[PDB]
């Protein structure tokens, strides 16, 4: 709002949720672990959202809408970030580092694993920075449900300013700044795609009683159909 670029970055960095652990595999047990983790992460996600500058200035109705829309995108970009320095693997948790082929343990999962791994590869290629990552995650929260207004578009502009500030600080030329900004935002289209796909997969797992899902996770899934 009246934050400076560095203030915005520090605030987003401070607001970061913790990295959670799993338990120290059939379809049922892997889906169990992943959905148990997701549920626990969601509780921290809600707290993080309240610390994204501008978010609590929104109505409760809007806060609910944005989180219900964005939650899987947000879990996924977190996963991809965690996984960046682990080529070919997904670091769901520090004690749950899954190779690409372990995705085959759940029907329909390997295709989603491949999309996530490709995203992690793309971040690695771009040398995505932590400060850029937290900007992107906030943009996902504020953007993904916003057409379904002006104060939010102002906050979104401020985060764009913050990304550009980071790139200028890194020594990028004007041309390089705009190109990199575009590269980063285009990855959000891919994160949306993966979330759409992941949502259908979870739904399908829900229908099959493959796995007990928490009330919270059921309500978050439910918002999408």
């Amino acid at each position: 709002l009246s934050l400076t670029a560095d203030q915005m970055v520090s605030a987003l960095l401070d607001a970061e949720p913790p990295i959670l652990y799993s338990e120290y595999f059939s379809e049922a047990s892997m889906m169990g672990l992943l959905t148990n983790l997701a549920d626990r992460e969601l509780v921290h996600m809600i707290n993080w959202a309240k610390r994204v500058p501008g978010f609590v200035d929104l109505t409760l109705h809007d806060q609910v809408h944005l989180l219900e829309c964005a939650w899987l995108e947000i879990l996924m970009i977190g996963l991809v970030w965690r996984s960046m320095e682990h080529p070919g693997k997904l670091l769901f948790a520090p004690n749950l580092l899954l190779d690409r082929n372990q995705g085959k343990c759940v029907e329909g999962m390997v295709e989603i694993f491949d999309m996530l791994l490709a995203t992690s590869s793309r971040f690695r290629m771009m040398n995505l920075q932590g400060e850029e990552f937290v900007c992107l995650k906030s943009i996902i929260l504020l953007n993904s449900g916003v057409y379904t207004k002006d104060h939010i578009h102002r906050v979104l502009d401020k985060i764009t300013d913050t990304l550009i500030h980071l790139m200028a600080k890194a020594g990028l030329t004007l041309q390089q700044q705009h190109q990199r900004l575009a590269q980063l935002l285009l990855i959000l289209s891919h994160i949306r795609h993966m979330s759409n796909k992941g949502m259908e997969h979870l739904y399908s797992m829900k229908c099959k009683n493959v796995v007990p899902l928490s009330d919270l996770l059921l309500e978050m899934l439910d918002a999408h159909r």
Partner: peptide, 11 residues
């Protein structure tokens, strides 16, 4: 109320 709605206010 969904869980979310309360949690969003819980201090």
């Amino acid at each position: 109320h969904k869980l979310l709605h309360r949690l969003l206010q819980d201090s």
